[PDB]
Amino acid sequence: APEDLLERLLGEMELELIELRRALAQTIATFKS
Amino acid sequence: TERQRDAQQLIAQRWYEKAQAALDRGNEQLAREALGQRQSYQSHTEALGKSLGEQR
Amino acid sequence: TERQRDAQQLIAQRWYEKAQAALDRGNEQLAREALGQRQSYQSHTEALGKSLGEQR
Amino acid sequence: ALVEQVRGQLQKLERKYLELKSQKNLYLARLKSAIAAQKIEEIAGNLDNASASSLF
Amino acid sequence: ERIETKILELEAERELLNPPPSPLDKKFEQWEEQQAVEATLAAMKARRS
């Protein structure tokens, strides 16, 4: 369904945004070191 | 959506309240920056505000 | 929640009472710090106080 | 002369070795960020003109 | 650098998917903000001065 895809795609953004959240934190994880 | 507008508008009032307190005795440098902060919320106030009217 | 406000307000009065006794004969250094202590409770007094009105 | 020069090699090599490995994670941050940079906006393009938005 | 080419291989895509801010808007963002601060502070600098 387009809605389920919209949820899943936005969910995929949620899956990736958290990955960006993890990835961006990894960037911050090294600057202080 | 309307509740968000009130919250954003209240946040703008909160920032305006801080701007109201960041203005006295010549502290315009902080107000200069602080006032700009509200305009970011005003964009939402205008952007969400106009949208709310259309949805009616 | 209202009982907490009274207790916090009484605590603020207690701190104000200590501030009232930490002020005499030029002991402003202790009052300078002591008065700041109440404002921490005042934040609760204002924060919880405003919330109580909304809940009504 | 043999022992002195070789110690400097290891120290310089190890000093260079750690710096090379030091820059590793700093750039791998851009790697996943680059992966995040594209595939995030990749889903954004799915709701533009001729996209799902045109399906809308 | 091939990753950098990959970054540019995909940064350009976002450039086409999302055109960059034109210099005209930069003037606005840099000039329209002047009133956003001046006009907003114009009332503040006269309201309760």
Place this chain on the structure above:
Amino acid sequence: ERIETKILELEAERELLNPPPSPLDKKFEQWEEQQAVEATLAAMKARRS
């Protein structure tokens, strides 16, 4: 230090989960406190001096 990287691996997360106090608020926390002491003691230094 890998634990320190773990600390930073998770301190950064709290940084994203909870953004750090911006310097603007630091001015307030450092300036808004000035009235919180001055204004509060302004009455004390004049009320029962």
